[PDB]
Ligand code: HEM
Ligand code: HEM
Ligand SMILES: Cc1cc(N)nc(COc2cc(CCN3CCC(F)(F)CC3)cc(F)c2F)c1
Ligand SMILES: Cc1cc(N)nc(COc2cc(CCN3CCC(F)(F)CC3)cc(F)c2F)c1
Ligand SMILES: C[C@H](O)[C@H](O)[C@H]1CNc2nc(N)[nH]c(=O)c2N1
């Protein structure tokens with residue numbers, strides 16, 4: 001009927017009715033909760049390939065309805081024309097095309113709806129680049145460069161999304177094969193260890209296989225591997241002057257700069273699927289700006305990532321015999337101090353996890369005020385260090401799936417037939 | 420039906436069949452997940468299937484299912500429910516029930532020790548003085564001069580609801596909280612309400628920072644009664660730091676024995692409304708939650724102050740820096756006094772080992788990621804990366820209303 005969530009630090013109780021508009025399954029049941037499953041559900045809104053009219057149109061009707069409801073219409077002339085227009089369009093092309101307004105609406109609301117995104121207070125300030133006229137990988141390279149350059153903005157990062165042509169039959173997808181626009185290569189060393197970023201060893205090998213010439217450093221920005229209209233993907237090197245990087249140094253430890261660490265400034269997720277009114281935009285790279293922990297905790301300290309903890313602990317002269325000295329926890333703090341200090345010293349947008357989580361609490365409040373709820377994944381929202389000293393740790397959250405949304409999709413090299 | 424859980428750090432995949440045996444709700448629906456919600460007497464007819472379920476499972480665990488003894492027990496339980504509208508667990512069933520309620524505690528990271536549980540049967544207890552005696556012996560046994568040992572003491576089960584046994588304390592050892600006229604709090608701000616209840620019941624408070632609270636014990640539905648745990652049974656650890664000589668000057672201490680006492684133990688449909696159980700601490704419970712939660716002792720600013728940290732902006736991570744040192748202090752202090760403690764790294768690693776074993780021998784292990792992940796350094800512990808299925812098996816430990824919200828006072 002209606003569900004309350006409580007913050008146990010402040011005893012604020014919020015009352016959620018927005019979940020009544022939830023469309024697809026969470027993966028949980030009355031008897032089993034999957035809230036820590038990374039991909040709990042395969043409930044998609046349309047079949048795998050080109051859907052029949054009774055399949056795609058209801059999804060379309062729902063989104064147009066929602067969009068016109070959003071803008072204080074519904075039933076207006078333009079709404080009833082838009083329905084008949086989408087009707088005839090599906091009647092004659094098995095798909096339909098979004099107007100520019102609806103596309104901008106759907107992107108912003110997919111972001112707004114992203115229960116895993118702590119950054120959503122910014123949701124309505126999204127720059128939407130319409131790339132639906134794109135037709136070749138070279139055109140995708142042009143569009144993505146413009147995205148990177150606009151979003152980077154000489155460090156004053158700007159949120160943006162570039163939306164390439166929607167899926168038609170499934171054999172013609174546009175995909176950015178890179179999981180993110182800018183990542184560092186991972187190199188399988190002969191002994192068995194790994195140089196660079198271990199997460200990317202496979203993708204780095206597809207790139208080498210596709211003819212990329214690895215510099216074989218620790219921070220080799222990977223080429224783009226762009227696929228247009230289902231064709232074989234093509235490699236492009238992003239102009240280095242477009243890839244802003246921050247050398248990581250520490251405000252107290254002078255020896256820290258000598259770890260040779262740097263990171264890139266723009267986080268740009270490029271492997272997710274944007275779904276609006278039943279249409280599926282398989283190539284929609286979206287970017288914002290980093291939360292320090294993503295680099296300082298996950299990218300740097302995960303065991304199967306850069307794994308610098310013991311290296312930094314050594315330089316710190318920390319008791320590393322046993323776990324209880326908390327040498328890992330201590331170094332982990334210093335690394336995230338360095339990351340934050342470095343980005344701010346170079347005037348590159350970055351938000352610490354205290355500020356970010358605080359903003360999200362404010363966002364939840366706004367959303368419950370105006371929308372009647374805010375889907376949020378507590379497992380993703382709580383930062384990967386110092387969880388309980390951030391306000392979201394003490395904040396109950398309801399999770400549910402609202403459309404438009406960003407969705408996971410298979411890695412294209414698992415599903416692509418080469419030519 | 421099967422369900423797979425992945426570890427994204429190791430790629431190990433486990434297959435959960437055990438979830439097919441849960442029965443009460445998780446709180447989640449098919450379209451909403453409530454996995455971060457903290458909190459989401461039986462008739463004769465209701466009790467028979469619950470009883471049979473538990474007796475069936477006990478006899479299954481001991482490879483005696485279908486046996487002569489299984490079937491007579493089942494019939495013997497049915498007669499009791501017919502006669503008395505309830506039944507009595509055998510001692511073996513009580514021990515097994517209690518161990519398995521711990522085993523099934525999806526929020527508990529220390530379940531690798533679930534089968535080493537000392538079970539104190541206190542179902543013959545009739546008065547608050549009796550409960551105190553039992554609880555004193557529990558505390559002495561568990562504390563074991565710092566070599567802490569897991570233990571539960573089980574008092575008589577619910578009958579009509581009018582005769583509940585209750586430990587009104589949320590935990591057996593807690594420090595008192597006193598709000599001052601000026602709004603400030605002395606002691607443990609969490610326990611201010613419960614301290615007020617004791618003071619009203621007659622407890623004379625020392626009004627200090629680490630006053631061990633008195634037990635407030637209710638037997639057979641009667642008004643609860645006050646008892647002072649004998650001070651020699653409350654092992655405490657003064658918190659010092661290995662590096663900062665100044666840390667001892669914070670005057671911090673903590674009690675060695677964590678002993679939860681406000682929960683309900685549910686075995687075969689029977690409700691044991693008073694079942695205090697204890698183990699030993701994970702360091703972050705004290706060092707992160709007890710000390711650094713804002714609603715708690717809130718010593719981050721104090722500790723950061725003494726670290727000459729820049730506390731102007733959050734991005735200096737002064738809170739994270741001070742939190743780590745505090746948790747080092749907690750572990751170093753307990754270890755130096757040879758009082759059992761476990762750091763969150765060692766604890767999470769053992770629980771993964773345990774979880775894996777539980778999938779192998781039992782077909783799964785229900786687990787609450789929101790509670791298993793430590794409250795600091797979350798992703799540098801192995802559990803953060805471990806997918807976990809959450810579901811509710813019985814026997815279970817269950818939450819229950821605070822007794823002062825339900826008790827109807829006898830004394831005029
Ligand atoms: C503007 C600054 C932003 C910040 C600080 C931010 C923060 C974050 C963080 C920390 C995560 C978790 C990332 C991880 O642990 O891998 C996340 C997830 C996510 N964000 Fe945001 N975000 C921002 C902008 C955006 C934008 C512009 C979009 C889309 C238009 C977006 C959509 C998402 C989605 C879909 C996820 C889930 C990703 C997944 O499931 O793998 N975010 N965000
Ligand atoms: C032996 C060492 C033990 C360790 C290291 C341990 C560790 C923990 C921790 C860290 C929590 C989370 C507590 C919180 O954040 O408030 C917890 C919860 C819990 N533990 Fe264990 N525990 C231990 C023993 C036990 C025993 C002996 C029992 C029962 C016989 C038990 C049953 C539970 C239950 C039911 C919870 C959930 C608490 C709640 O829901 O409020 N644990 N444990
Ligand atoms: C828009 C946006 C803003 C922001 N501030 N952050 C993000 C998240 O962006 C990245 C995320 C990752 C890691 C993704 N992670 C890998 C392991 C996993 F698969 F298990 C879960 C997903 C690497 C990157 F380079 C990223 F830019 C996105
Ligand atoms: C057997 C066992 C071992 C262990 N290692 N730990 C525990 C849990 O022990 C305690 C937990 C708490 C606080 C519980 N917490 C209160 C705030 C909340 F209500 F929000 C959520 C529950 C206080 C204490 F004194 C504790 F001993 C139990
Ligand atoms: C809102 C949220 O569920 C709440 O803060 C939970 C989070 N995880 C927790 N985890 C543990 N171990 N103990 C807790 O009290 C909590 N509190």
Ligand SMILES: C[C@H](O)[C@H](O)[C@H]1CNc2nc(N)[nH]c(=O)c2N1
Nearest residue numbers: 036038379380427803804805806
């Ligand atoms: C198993 C677990 O769900 C997985 O490791 C999750 C935990 N929470 C996370 N939270 C964020 N923000 N990002 C992640 O990659 C993860 N990983």
Ligand SMILES: [Zn+2]
Nearest residue numbers: 028033447452
């Ligand atoms: Zn759930």
